[PDB]
Design a protein around this ligand. Structure first.
Ligand SMILES: *C(=O)/C=C/c1ccc(O)cc1
Length: 107
């Protein structure tokens, strides 16, 4: 996975670094969130863009994965947007490039 195929994925896909800063953000995720990729890239996913994820079930799982070198998690979650609660399944894992990590979002 590491362009037009990337924005056409059936699942949402976000690439972050070890401190949480967004490097890649696809269109499928933009469609599920309402966020434009250009103002979101360069900002921190956990502290700025998606604060609802700043709990031990999500950001804690991310922090532990980075600190142990291997990020590998699969869990159910619910995104608390302005309109209504959107139930999703999250898949977190490492990338082919060092210091880079992936967050996959489905449904
Ligand atoms: C909670 O604050 C979730 C926010 C959110 C999740 C995923 C995105 O792509 C954008 C915002």
């Amino acid at each position: 996975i590491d362009t037009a195929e990337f924005d056409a994925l059936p699942v949402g896909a976000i690439q972050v670094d070890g401190s949480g800063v967004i490097h890649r953000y696809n269109r499928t995720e933009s469609r599920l969130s309402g966020r434009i990729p250009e103002r979101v890239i360069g900002r921190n996913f956990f502290t700025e863009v998606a604060p609802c994820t700043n709990i031990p079930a999500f950001s804690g799982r991310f922090m532990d994965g980075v600190t142990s070198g291997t990020l590998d998690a699969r869990f159910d979650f619910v995104f608390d947007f302005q309109m209504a609660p959107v139930r999703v399944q999250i898949r977190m894992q490492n990338a082919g490039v060092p210091d880079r990590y992936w967050i996959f979002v489905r449904k």
